[PDB]
Design a protein around this motif. Structure first.
Motif, PDB file in Angstrom:
ATOM      1  N   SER A 152      -1.812  -1.043   7.447  1.00  0.00           N
ATOM      2  CA  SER A 152      -1.093  -0.350   6.363  1.00  0.00           C
ATOM      3  C   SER A 152      -1.790   0.933   5.869  1.00  0.00           C
ATOM      4  O   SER A 152      -1.105   1.930   5.637  1.00  0.00           O
ATOM      5  CB  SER A 152      -0.869  -1.287   5.184  1.00  0.00           C
ATOM      6  N   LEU A 153      -3.130   0.913   5.725  1.00  0.00           N
ATOM      7  CA  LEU A 153      -3.910   2.066   5.262  1.00  0.00           C
ATOM      8  C   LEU A 153      -3.918   3.204   6.290  1.00  0.00           C
ATOM      9  O   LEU A 153      -4.001   4.367   5.900  1.00  0.00           O
ATOM     10  CB  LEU A 153      -5.347   1.649   4.938  1.00  0.00           C
ATOM     11  N   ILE A 210       0.875  -1.179   0.000  1.00  0.00           N
ATOM     12  CA  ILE A 210       0.000   0.000   0.000  1.00  0.00           C
ATOM     13  C   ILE A 210       0.917   1.236   0.000  1.00  0.00           C
ATOM     14  O   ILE A 210       0.623   2.219  -0.682  1.00  0.00           O
ATOM     15  CB  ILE A 210      -1.020  -0.029   1.180  1.00  0.00           C
ATOM     16  CG1 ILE A 210      -2.129  -1.072   0.900  1.00  0.00           C
ATOM     17  CG2 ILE A 210      -1.641   1.358   1.444  1.00  0.00           C
ATOM     18  CD1 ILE A 210      -3.013  -1.484   2.118  1.00  0.00           C
TER      19      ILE A 210
END
Ligand SMILES: COc1ccc2cccc(CCNC(C)=O)c2c1
Length: 485
Positions: A122-123, A42
């Motif tokens: 991750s986001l 990401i």
């Protein structure tokens, strides 16, 4: 410098073209390929977006301003173009920091667990990075440190406006990420070498016959001493490298204690003759201490590892320390110095950690090792065997992705190293360093950092096999059409 103006326009023309096409391919490739569709990538998408931002609005204006030889646009068009250039450059280094932390945690997770590293948050970390980059670039509008520079035909952050702002920009947004990332890929490189260096087909318990208690009693009998908690040392004799001197000083501290009678010591190695004499001196004074100056076979060292209770690694500086890991293969509980590499291998569950260069604490650590019953030791040997087993587990893995992401960072560091170096020189005396710094050096430092924005997709294709496959996949799908016979 008439041609130097047109050449500078070409570098940007290349950058703009390769950035827009290339970084758009990276965004598509991650979504299209199932192999590249992992959560840990990401950050790669976030870094590619950061690269795309500058080629859409800032760089095109800089390209015109080369031909115009001045700023033919407004102050807002200068302030906003300089602002988006900030979010890009600052965003790029922090995203590279994210990947460096992600990949280090990935190797550590695959060691401790059988399941793969999920990268579940991750986001959230991407949004946190963009909230951090915005918090550092935003105060440059009110302070008024963004202004046009005729030499580089662009609206950038002026290093000569406020030296306090530049030193903070070099330390907190270049030197700080650099250290974090260099440390991350250093610890990755060691762990990959440890995976490489271990041999579970040689250093295996199977090669040994009888029980550990019988094999220890057999080894001690051949050395002319009865049963007891047997300690082992193996390494060259030196004043400040493998720390045989620390072990020797510690035996003298323990020789007076009533606990020493229940101990056995097997020292192996050769080096400084003064230390070689000190060892042979204690060998005479105490019959529970045996010294081996001769070179022992890998086959016999394997039998020693499998027979002794502990292995003392009192090394001052040990970067890899395969010997600690090799000892754990055959159930030897290690007592080692808390040094880089040995800190990674030895868990608080597997071995005993001590401070390097202290004979007092090592003597007390050897005492703690003695104050352990047959039942306590059997689980410690099991953990030691299980820990060495997890290192060989990672041998068939394709560590090629770690090389690509390292090359991505390495190239970023080369592009921005002169710009952040000039920024420190200008910060010393802004009035004096404006003419003192050569014009070519100032222009090259800036345009290197500009060219970096198109570099990342070129690197992905030339090193990562999955990226090269998906590049041709998307290219052919849009070139070739659908038709019925
Ligand atoms: C610090 O914040 C910004 C804001 C906009 C920018 C626009 C272009 C380039 C830079 C980096 C130049 N900083 C150094 C230390 O060399 C920016 C940096």
């Amino acid at each position: 410098p008439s041609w130097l103006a047109s050449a500078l326009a070409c570098v940007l023309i290349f950058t703009i073209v390769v950035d827009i096409l290339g970084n758009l391919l990276v965004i598509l490739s991650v979504y299209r390929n199932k192999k590249l569709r992992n959560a840990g990538n990401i950050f790669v998408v976030s870094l590619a977006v950061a690269n795309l931002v500058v080629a859409i609005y800032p760089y095109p204006l800089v390209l015109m301003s080369i031909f115009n030889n001045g700023w033919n646009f407004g102050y807002l068009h200068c302030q906003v173009s300089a602002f988006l250039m900030g979010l890009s450059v600052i965003g790029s280094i922090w995203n590279i920091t994210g990947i460096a932390i992600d990949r280090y945690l990935y190797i550590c997770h695959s060691l401790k667990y059988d399941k793969l590293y999920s990268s579940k948050n991750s986001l959230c970390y991407v949004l946190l990075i963009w909230l951090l980059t915005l918090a550092a670039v935003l105060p440059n509008l009110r302070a008024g440190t963004l202004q046009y520079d005729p030499r580089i035909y662009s609206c950038t952050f002026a290093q000569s406006v406020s030296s306090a702002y530049t030193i903070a920009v070099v330390v907190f947004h270049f030197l700080v990420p650099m250290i974090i990332v260099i440390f991350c890929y250093l610890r990755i490189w060691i762990l990959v070498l440890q995976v490489r260096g271990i041999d579970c087909s040689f250093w295996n318990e199977s090669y040994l016959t009888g029980s550990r208690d019988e094999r220890k009693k057999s080894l001690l009998s051949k050395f002319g001493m009865d049963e007891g908690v047997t300690f082992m040392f193996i390494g060259r004799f030196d004043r400040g490298q493998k720390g045989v001197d620390v072990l020797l000083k510690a035996i003298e501290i323990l020789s007076s204690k009533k606990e020493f009678q229940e101990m056995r010591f097997i020292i192996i190695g050769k080096g400084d003759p003064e230390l070689e004499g000190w060892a042979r001196s204690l060998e005479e004074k105490h019959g529970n201490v045996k010294v081996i100056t001769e070179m022992l076979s890998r086959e016999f060292v394997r039998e020693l590892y499998g027979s002794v209770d502990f292995v003392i690694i009192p090394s001052y500086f040990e970067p890899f320390g395969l010997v600690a890991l090799e000892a754990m293969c055959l159930g030897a509980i290690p007592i080692a110095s808390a040094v880089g590499g040995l800190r990674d291998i030895i868990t608080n569950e597997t071995g005993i950690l001590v401070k390097a260069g202290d004979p007092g604490e090592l003597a007390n650590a050897i005492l703690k090792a003695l104050e352990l019953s047959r039942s306590d030791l059997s689980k410690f040997r099991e953990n030691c065997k299980k820990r060495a087993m997890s290192f060989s587990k990672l041998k068939p893995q394709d560590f090629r992705n770690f090389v690509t992401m390292f090359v991505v960072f390495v190239l970023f560091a080369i592009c921005f190293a002169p710009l952040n170096f000039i920024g420190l020189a200008v910060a010393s005396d802004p009035a004096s360093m404006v003419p003192r710094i050569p014009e070519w050096l100032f222009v090259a430092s800036y345009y290197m950092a500009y060219f970096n924005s198109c570099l990342n997709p070129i690197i992905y294709g030339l090193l990562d096999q999955n990226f090269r496959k998906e590049y041709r996949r998307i290219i052919v799908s849009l070139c070739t059409a659908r038709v019925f016979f």
